[PDB]
Design a protein around this ligand. Structure first.
Ligand code: CLA
Ligand code: CLA
Ligand code: CLA
Ligand code: CLA
Ligand code: CLA
Ligand code: CLA
Ligand SMILES: CCCCCC(=O)OC\C(C=C=C1C(C)(C)C[C@H](OC(C)=O)C[C@@]1(C)O)=C/C=C/C(C)=C/C=C/C=C(C)/C=C/C=C(\C)C(=O)C[C@@]12O[C@]1(C)C[C@@H](O)CC2(C)C
Ligand SMILES: CCCCCC(=O)OC\C(C=C=C1C(C)(C)C[C@H](OC(C)=O)C[C@@]1(C)O)=C/C=C/C(C)=C/C=C/C=C(C)/C=C/C=C(\C)C(=O)C[C@@]12O[C@]1(C)C[C@@H](O)CC2(C)C
Ligand SMILES: CC(=O)O[C@H]1CC(C)(C)C(=C=C/C(C)=C/C=C/C(C)=C/C=C/C=C(C)/C=C/C=C(\C)C(=O)C[C@@]23O[C@]2(C)C[C@@H](O)CC3(C)C)[C@](C)(O)C1
Ligand code: KC2
Ligand code: KC2
Lengths: 168, 171, 156, 210, 218
């Protein structure tokens, strides 16, 4: 059932790209699971690329991130996108992870990944399923490019010389 | 017109002056006017609140030596925009309303575009809520948030024209 | 519970990509379940041991907290031999259980004689999930102890 | 263009070294490829024929009014463009910019029966101007309403003569403009103009692009 | 298809030579495929090497002659030994050359208009047409990679196969010539009749960007 999906990209001549044959023997309720994992990776990667660009360009908020122990948003931004990740206090990291996990638990109990392949029922911008398949393919391609891009940003910030066309 | 959208809250159908009981055929134009006003008001309120703690990086013109972080908060921020930037903002709004999001058909006054709903711009690539209870709730939420944003944007404008900020004194 | 085996948790269901359990004999399933459960139990013991021995090590005195150093700085050869003898005794009993013609895989209690409810399956799933978590935690703990030289309750 | 260039010229005719008639031109088509080229054939002719005749009057006499007057005449008129004020340069380009925008309006072009040139319309056809927001006395082509009573044979002869005089003048002005800077380019002239500034730079004497 | 390989070669140099391969790269299987796929891959590799070699030989002749792009960044470097011109290029220029070539061959691998791949039965060394499928490219570009101005377009198939044979022979000769020039840049005395030309050069020609490893210990 891997030949159906949406992910058939014209960059690989509109056929399924599985050189290691990872989806040869995987069955339903796992194919939908790996599609849900890919879609969540897509969305988190796109949000991560936008946030990384916002931090690297410098933007940041105005105020004090944790008035008990200093640390302004300018202090977080000035350390860089990667090195300015430990400048956040541990309580802020735990609160962010707790809110994300509450959303994860609610959406997993409401829309299980094994049954719903990455579909959490967010409205929908079009009917006419051909256009919707085109929009799904656009989402998949954008998310895959963002998956490559955020790891590229992390590698270029940590190891200089890699990613030659890296801004900042 | 008492059963249409917007007549949901504690007041029910609230028309003191009776604009739509004097002219019940003029409700659709008034609804479109209210919907555009509400959407512009939501954008304006969000801009007022977000510009206080969030500011873009870099310059604004790189020719008048004006920064994004140098525009104070409000009316003076729109003052310090260069004339080319103002012209581009007006061009964007004019192209956005005359051709893309077209609220009016008709030669001079503008009735409603065909048999569409009032404020039924954009089209095609826009979320179309099925499940008519959900659609009614979403539309009533849009209208009520628009009205609240109109009052809030008016208040912050009143504050900005007599202070340097939209925050009332004592806050 | 699919194929008579507990598992199949909520966040991800019957987790068999790569087809390890497609078209396989029940003996292979018993071997896989034995491996998974024994890994989980060893790893729960390992995680609890490093966590407790980081801050509470009274058995020999001052005995460091970097876990690979713990096994070599002391624990004389008789102690390691006694630990290995105990584990070998339990593994011999595991083999003797595996030869019996009532062999539920990870079962030394032999619960086929007693009546079981879905609460029993829930508790088995609790053991399995905690085991898998400790598998990942124990590998991570040993990796940190090699990279930095500090225990789990250290490094923080 | 079709193979009817034999009417414009025998011996030669559809010479076409760089093929250019089927490169599909933004994916529009082969007819649209022909229609765009034929318009740019004669639009470049109409500018060059007016500019070369424009040259031969500028270098001797100037209009006696005021603003584009009293600047030196014994110089290159390409340099005389650089002596214009900045408002004059903007207004000249934008006035042509109206004429370009107005002539490409397909709803104006269908008032007189024609269409946009590479959608099937005639390559060169300026509109008869009578649809503007406010009326004007004089239009652009045939202002005095003089020679629109001519038969199609005089129009067909004139259209071919417009092309052939077009190709002759595009060589005429550009070879002449190549004589102002890099002197000695045309050994037939070689006795006019100076100045090494770029003629393809209307605002070089006023500001810089970066 | 170890039979059409001989039909191609009977027209290569008459029967004076034919199917000449001492180590017999034909009748091979390679990466878990059939002999026909390997034959098509080897033919495409030979054709691509030949095209790259003719382009490189012409570029070496032009660059060592002295013809150089005036513009702006290529005016900065002032040498002659083509290899050293590549070495003193900016890193971004070399990377953009490499990535543009990579995009061109990424398009060459894509078969959305022509039905067969060059391993699955297509013509070896066939770059697919850009405008054949105008709805399956990211944005429109005219001026296709092969035949930008449609100069060949309508031609006899006999002329096409004769041109393919001519391209193959010229490619092989250009391969030999450009390797002779590179070995002139590296090994003096090698490749006679060319000793009086080319400059001495170091820096492992078959490596871009950084240098200083080389085949110093042969
Ligand atoms: C989180 C990563 C992730 C996951 C889970 C998937 C999952 C999937 N992809 Mg996919 N993809 C990804 C990332 C991912 N993709 C990226 C980044 C790209 C861009 C290169 C693509 C491009 C792509 C194409 C073009 C196609 C798919 C398709 C598919 C589906 C079937 C293939 C399959 O089962 O094998 C993937 C299953 C996995 C479990 C892969 C996990 C990742 C491995 C184990 C690790 C690899 C490490 C990597 C090599 C290190 C370098 C990467 C990076 C650092 C640069 C499946 C739902 C096909 C499809 O849907 O067609 C219907 C298809 O045609 N993908
Ligand atoms: C309390 C927090 C919380 C909880 C309960 C969940 C719960 C869930 N997340 Mg989730 N997530 C969270 C926070 C949380 N998330 C945050 C903060 C992020 C970052 C924005 C993500 C990003 C994320 C992605 C991208 C994906 C999930 C997925 C999942 C689901 C399966 C998780 C799984 O199998 O274990 C995790 C199992 C593993 C084997 C771990 C992955 C190991 C990879 C190979 C290496 C990654 C590094 C590692 C995670 C970091 C550890 C430290 C490092 C130094 C080693 C589940 C619904 C997945 C899903 O729904 O797919 C069906 C999925 O694709 N989440
Ligand atoms: C992978 C996603 C991701 C992660 C992990 C972070 C992490 C971080 N961001 Mg960040 N950010 C992101 C995306 C992300 N961002 C995006 C997409 C934007 C553009 C709007 C920003 C804009 C942004 C600014 C302007 C600032 C940060 C800052 C920070 C740091 C402090 C925490 C904070 O205040 O967050 C704030 C994060 C947000 C406001 C964005 C949250 C993501 C939105 C709400 C989408 C969530 C989807 C929703 C839950 C479900 C929809 C369905 C922290 C390192 C601050 C800092 O000190 O760094 C310079 C800061 O000033 N971020
Ligand atoms: C009614 C709509 C509206 C209007 C007229 C403005 C007007 C302005 N905003 Mg603003 N803004 C708006 C909505 C609006 N905003 C919204 C909805 C947000 C996001 C929640 C922002 C976020 C924002 C930031 C972060 C910044 C501005 C800034 C500015 C000022 C100059 C830059 C500019 O126009 O582009 C700004 C961008 C937009 C208008 C795009 C939104 C559509 C100007 C006074 C800048 C400034 O210096 O203000 C003092 C600045 O740094 N805006
Ligand atoms: C080696 C340990 C091990 C073994 C033998 C098993 C065995 C089994 N698991 Mg299981 N599992 C494990 C670890 C293990 N698990 C871990 C760590 C997790 C947490 C992510 C899970 C989560 C899990 C779920 C959620 C489910 C199972 C299920 C099953 C059963 C059927 C699936 C199957 O055929 O797997 C056969 C497994 C193997 C042959 C082991 C493959 C080992 C490979 C070679 C490891 C490769 C490296 C790995 C990908 C990453 C490790 C390195 C990392 C630390 C960097 C089977 C008895 C299913 C079940 O109970 O069905 C009723 C089920 O639903 N497992
Ligand atoms: C329970 C799972 C778990 C958790 C919570 C962490 C937690 C952490 N790991 Mg980690 N890790 C894990 C499993 C885990 N790891 C596994 C299974 C491996 C083997 C692939 C690693 C390999 C690993 C490396 C190689 C590194 C971490 C590091 C880190 C720290 C950042 C953080 C404390 C980093 C660290 O040492 O931080 C101090 C680091 O460099 N991890
Ligand atoms: C040929 C040109 C190539 C350019 C390069 C490029 O491509 O960069 C790629 C790249 C990075 C990179 C590079 C490499 C790839 C590694 C290559 C280079 O290395 C070399 C030497 O080569 C360097 C570098 C840096 O360039 C990164 C790409 C990042 C990418 C692609 C980021 C997408 C975000 C999408 C978002 C956030 C969507 C939000 C959408 C949202 C939030 C919504 O829809 C909201 C929604 O409410 C809506 C509106 C309607 C609702 O109903 C539904 C919901 C609720 C969902
Ligand atoms: C791509 C562009 C999309 C643009 C549209 C958009 O972005 O809409 C996003 C959207 C929903 C949506 C979507 C659709 C629109 C349905 C479709 C989209 O998908 C597409 C593309 O189809 C995505 C989706 C699902 O998200 C909704 C946005 C709603 C918004 C922005 C609502 C602002 C309220 C402000 C209020 C009530 C202020 C009250 C102010 C009050 C009450 C005050 O008195 C102010 C006050 O100051 C005073 C005067 C004194 C102070 O002392 C105290 C305070 C401070 C209290
Ligand atoms: C020192 C010296 O030399 O003195 C010289 C200086 C100088 C200046 C050289 C001289 C001169 C005059 C010259 C040379 C004047 C030349 C002016 C010239 C030749 C100006 C071209 C404009 C080209 C345009 C606008 C192209 C648009 C092109 C476009 C928009 C496209 O490419 C679109 C495209 O759709 C196509 C068409 C094909 C499609 O399939 C695909 C795509 C989408 C890509 C002199 C007078 O001789 C003296
Ligand atoms: C500075 C600009 C300029 C110059 C120097 C110039 C020189 C010549 C010469 C001398 C070599 C000839 C012989 C000639 C002949 C024709 N011209 Mg020109 N012409 C210029 C501009 C325009 C414009 C704007 C239009 C136009 C037209 C026609 C028509 C057809 C009319 C008809 O068929 O109704 C004919 C026959 C109109 C058009 O082609 O519309 C169909 C039209 O709108 N012309 N034209
Ligand atoms: C560095 C670049 C380069 C060089 C130096 C070069 C030299 C020669 C020479 C002189 C030695 C000849 C005589 C010749 C002849 C042919 N070339 Mg080459 N060619 C180069 C590039 C390409 C590309 C990219 C393609 C291509 C092709 C053809 C076809 C087939 C046309 C057809 O079958 O319609 C024929 C006849 C196309 C192809 O092979 O299609 C199957 C195609 O895609 N060529 N080519």
């Amino acid at each position: 059932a891997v030949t159906d999906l949406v992910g058939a990209s014209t960059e690989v001549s509109n056929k399924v790209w599985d050189p290691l044959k990872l989806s040869e023997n995987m069955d339903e309720s796992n194919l939908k699971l790996v599609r849900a994992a890919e879609l969540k990776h897509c969305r988190v990667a796109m949000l991560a690329t936008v946030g990384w660009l916002w931090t690297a360009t410098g933007t940041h908020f105005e105020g004090m991130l944790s008035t008990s122990s200093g640390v302004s948003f300018a202090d977080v931004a000035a350390a860089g996108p990667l090195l300015g990740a430990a400048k956040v206090p541990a309580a802020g990291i735990w609160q962010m992870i707790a809110a994300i996990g509450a959303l994860e638990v609610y959406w997993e109990n409401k829309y299980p990944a094994a049954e719903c392949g990455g579909d959490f029922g967010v409205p929908r911008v079009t009917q006419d399923p051909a256009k919707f398949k085109e929009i799904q393919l656009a989402e998949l391609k954008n998310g895959r490019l963002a998956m490559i891009g955020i790891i590229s940003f992390a590698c270029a910030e940590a190891i200089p010389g890699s990613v030659p066309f890296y801004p900042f | 017109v008492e059963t249409e959208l917007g007549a949901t809250g504690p007041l029910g159908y609230w028309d003191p002056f009776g604009f739509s009981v004097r002219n019940p055929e003029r409700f659709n134009r008034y609804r479109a006017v209210e919907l555009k006003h509400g959407r512009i008001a939501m954008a304006a309120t969000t801009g007022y609140m977000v510009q206080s703690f969030l500011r873009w990086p870099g310059y604004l013109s790189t020719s008048a030596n004006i920064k994004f972080a140098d525009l104070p908060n409000g009316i003076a921020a729109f003052k310090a925009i260069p004339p080319a930037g103002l012209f581009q903002i007006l061009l964007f709004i004019g192209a956005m309303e005359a051709f893309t999001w077209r609220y009016y058909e008709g030669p001079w006054p503008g009735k409603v575009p065909e048999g569409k709903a009032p404020g039924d711009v954009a089209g095609d690539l826009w979320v179309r809520y099925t499940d008519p209870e959900e659609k009614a709730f979403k539309l009533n939420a849009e209208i009520n948030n628009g009205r609240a944003a109109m009052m809030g944007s008016l208040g912050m404008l009143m504050h900005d024209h007599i202070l340097g900020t939209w925050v009332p004194p004592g806050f | 519970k699919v194929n008579g085996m507990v598992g199949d948790c909520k966040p991800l269901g019957y987790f068999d990509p790569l087809g390890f359990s497609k078209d396989a004999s029940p003996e292979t399933m018993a071997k896989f379940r034995e491996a998974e459960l024994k890994h989980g139990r060893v790893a729960m013991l390992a995680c609890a041991g490093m966590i407790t021995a980081d801050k509470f090590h009274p058995l020999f005195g001052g005995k460091l907290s970097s876990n690979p150093l713990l096994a070599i700085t002391q624990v004389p050869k008789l102690g390691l031999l006694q630990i290995l003898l105990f584990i070998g005794f339990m593994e011999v009993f595991g083999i003797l259980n595996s030869r019996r013609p009532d062999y539920e895989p990870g079962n030394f209690l032999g619960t086929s004689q007693w009546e079981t409810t879905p609460t029993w399956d829930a508790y088995q799933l609790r053991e399995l999930n905690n085991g898998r978590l400790a598998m990942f935690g124990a590998i991570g703990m040993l990796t940190h102890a090699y990279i930095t030289g500090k225990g789990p309750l250290e490094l923080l | 263009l079709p193979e009817l260039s034999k009417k414009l010229n025998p011996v030669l005719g559809y010479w076409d070294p760089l093929n250019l008639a089927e490169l599909n031109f933004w994916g529009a088509g082969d007819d649209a490829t022909v229609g765009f080229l034929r318009h740019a054939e004669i639009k470049h002719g109409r500018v060059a024929m007016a500019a070369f005749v424009g040259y031969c009057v500028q270098s001797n006499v100037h209009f006696p009014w005021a603003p584009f007057n009293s600047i030196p005449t014994n110089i290159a008129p390409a340099e005389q463009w650089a002596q214009l004020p900045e408002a004059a340069k903007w207004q000249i380009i934008l006035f042509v910019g109206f004429l370009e925008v107005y002539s490409e309006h397909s709803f104006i072009l269908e008032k007189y029966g024609q269409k946009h040139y590479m959608k099937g319309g005639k390559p060169g056809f300026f509109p008869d101007f009578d649809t503007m927001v406010h009326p004007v006395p004089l239009n652009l082509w045939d202002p005095l309403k003089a020679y629109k009573g001519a038969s199609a044979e005089r129009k067909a002869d004139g259209l071919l003569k417009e092309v052939n005089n077009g190709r002759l003048a595009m060589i005429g002005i550009m070879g002449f403009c190549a004589e102002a800077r890099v002197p000695g380019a045309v050994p037939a002239l070689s006795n006019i103009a100076h100045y090494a500034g770029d003629p393809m730079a209307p605002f070089a004497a006023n500001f810089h692009l970066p | 298809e170890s039979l059409s390989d001989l039909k191609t070669l009977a027209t290569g140099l008459n029967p004076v030579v034919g199917y000449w391969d001492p180590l017999k790269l034909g009748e091979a299987e390679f990466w878990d495929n059939t002999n026909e796929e390997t034959i098509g891959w080897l033919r495409h590799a030979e054709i691509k090497h030949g095209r790259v070699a003719m382009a490189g030989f012409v570029g070496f002749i032009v660059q060592a002659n002295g013809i150089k792009f005036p513009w702006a960044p290529f005016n900065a470097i002032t040498s002659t030994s083509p290899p050293e011109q590549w070495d003193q290029l900016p890193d971004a220029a070399k990377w953009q050359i490499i990535l543009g070539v990579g995009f061109l061959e990424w398009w060459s691998e894509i078969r959305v208009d022509g039905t067969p791949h060059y391993m699955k039965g297509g013509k070896p060394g066939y770059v697919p047409d850009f405008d054949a499928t105008p709805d399956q490219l990211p944005h429109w570009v005219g001026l296709n990679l092969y035949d930008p101005l449609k100069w060949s377009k309508g031609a006899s198939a006999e002329k096409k196969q004769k041109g393919l044979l001519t391209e193959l022979n010229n490619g092989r000769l250009a391969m030999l010539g450009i390797m002779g020039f590179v070995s002139e840049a590296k090994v003096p005395g090698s490749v006679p009749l060319l000793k009086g030309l080319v400059a001495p050069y170091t820096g492992e020609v078959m490596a871009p960007f950084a240098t200083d490893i080389d085949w110093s210990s042969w």
